[PDB]
Amino acid sequence: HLTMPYVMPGDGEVVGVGEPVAIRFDENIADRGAAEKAIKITTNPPVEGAFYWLNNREVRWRPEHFWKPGTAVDVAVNTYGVDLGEGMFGEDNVQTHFTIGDEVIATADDNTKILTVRVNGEVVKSMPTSMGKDSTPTANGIYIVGSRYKHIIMDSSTYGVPVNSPNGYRTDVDWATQISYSGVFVHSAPWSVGAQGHTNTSHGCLNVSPSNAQWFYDHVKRGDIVEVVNTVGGTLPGIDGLGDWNIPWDQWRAGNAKA
Numbered sequence: 001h002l003t004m005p006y007v008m009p010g011d012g013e014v015v016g017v018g019e020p021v022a023i024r025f026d027e028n029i030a031d032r033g034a035a036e037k038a039i040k041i042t043t044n045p046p047v048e049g050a051f052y053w054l055n056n057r058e059v060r061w062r063p064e065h066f067w068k069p070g071t072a073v074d075v076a077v078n079t080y081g082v083d084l085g086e087g088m089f090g091e092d093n094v095q096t097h098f099t100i101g102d103e104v105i106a107t108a109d110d111n112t113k114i115l116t117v118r119v120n121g122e123v124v125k126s127m128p129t130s131m132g133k134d135s136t137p138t139a140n141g142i143y144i145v146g147s148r149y150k151h152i153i154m155d156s157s158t159y160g161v162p163v164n165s166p167n168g169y170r171t172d173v174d175w176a177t178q179i180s181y182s183g184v185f186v187h188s189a190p191w192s193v194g195a196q197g198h199t200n201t202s203h204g205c206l207n208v209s210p211s212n213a214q215w216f217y218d219h220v221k222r223g224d225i226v227e228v229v230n231t232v233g234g235t236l237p238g239i240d241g242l243g244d245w246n247i248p249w250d251q252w253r254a255g256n257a258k259a
Contacts, residue, residue, distance in 0.1 A: 002091040003027040003084060005077045009222065014101045017066040018144040019223025020244050021049075021075050021096075028056040030085025032257040035059060038082050038090065042074040050253040054239045064249040066225065067100040069120070104224040106216075108138070108206055110231040113197045115186070115206060117220070125219075127212040128197030130189065132204040136167070137233035139204075142245040143179040143226040148217050152176050156203070159183035169203075175213035179206075179226050181241030186226070188213035200231075 008022045009015050021041060029035050036051045041061055043049070049063045074097045079090030106117045108129055117125040132138040156168035159182060163170045176187040182204075189196070189207030196208060206226070208216070220226075225245075228236075238247035 001087050001089060003029070003079075003088050004091045005079050005094050007075055007077050007094045007096045009096060009098045011096045011098065013098045013222070015098060016145060016221055016223030016225065017069065017100055017103050017105075018142070018225040018245060019067070019100070020060040020062040020144070021073065022058060022060050023075075023077055023094075024058045025084075026057070027088055029059075030088065031083070032059070032259075034082055034084050035079070036255075036257055038077065038079045040076045040078065042076075044072045047071070051255055051257070052244070052247065052252045053256050053259070054241065054244075060244055062244060062252070064253070066103070066245075069100050069103050071100040073098050073100070100223075101221065104220060106220060106224070106226045108226060108228045110138075110200070110229065113200075115208060115212075115226075117216075125212070125215060127208045127216075130192050130196045130198075130202055130207040131200045131228070131231060132202050132233065133200050134232055136203045137200070138184065138202070138206065138228055138231050139233040139236040140228050140231050141236035141243065143184065143228065143236060144242040144244065145220055145222055145224045145226060146178040146181075146242050147222070148178070149176045150174065150217070154183075154185070154187070154205075167203075174210065175217045177213075177217050177220060179242060180236060182236075186213060186216050186220075 077094040080093045082090040108115045115127045115129045155170045161168045174188040176185045186206040188210040236243040
C-alpha cells in the first residue's frame with residue numbers, strides 16, 4: 001500500500017527543448033487527480049504547462065511549444081502521505097531541478113533523404129540517411145531523443161518480432177541514439193552507406209554513416225528533437241513514450257485524469 005515516485009529528468013541535468021517532465025510510479029495510480037495536485041512545477045521564465053498520462057504509472061508535463069532555451073525548471077513531487085486511491089499512499093517526496101540547453105532539432109526528410117541538424121536555427125550537419133523500407137516504414141512526426149548507446153544488440157524481439165520469424169533479426173550496432181520506445185534509433189549502418197541518401201532499407205531506424213552516427217551520439221542529447229517528414233508511414237503515437245508532441249496541445253491540456 002505505499003508507492004514511490006521517480007522523477008526525470010534527473011536533478012541537475014541539462015536537457016533539450018522537447019523534454020517533458022516525467023513522474024513514474026511503481027504502482028498503478030487510481031486517483032490521477034490526487035497525483036497531479038501533489039506535483040508542483042515552477043518554470044523561469046514562466047510558461048504554461050499541463051499534465052497528460054501516458055499510461056497508468058506515468059504522467060508527463062510539458063508546455064504547448066518546445067521549451068525556450070535557458071529555462072530553468074523546478075519539480076516538487078509532494079506525494080508523501082497522499083492518498084492516491086485504492087488504499088495506496090505516497091511513500092515520499094521527490095524533486096528535480098533542471099535546465100533547458102540549446103535548441104537542437106534534427107529533421108529527417110524522406111523526399112531528400114537527408115537528416116539535417118539545426119542548432120538554434122542554423123544548419124550544422126547534413127547526413128544522408130536510409131529510413132524504413134516501405135513494408136516497415138519510419139513513421140512521420142515528432143520524436144524526443146532518449147538514451148544513447150555506444151554499442152547495442154538490436155534485437156527485433158525486444159520490440160515484438162521474434163528473431164527467428166521471417167522478419168526478425170538480432171544485430172550488433174554502434175552509436176545508437178533511441179528516438180522511440182517502439183524501437184526507432186538513429187545508428188551507424190556501415191553496410192548501407194551506398195543506399196544512404198537514395199533508398200530506404202531499414203526496419204524503421206534512421207540509418208546513417210558510422211561517423212555521422214557517432215556525431216549524432218555525441219551532439220544530440222536527451223530531450224533534443226527529431227522530426228520525420230514525408231515518409232510513407234503513419235504518425236508516431238503520442239503515447240509511445242517519446243512521442244508526446246504528437247498529441248496536439250488542446251488534447252494534451254485537457255488531460256486524462258479521469259481515464
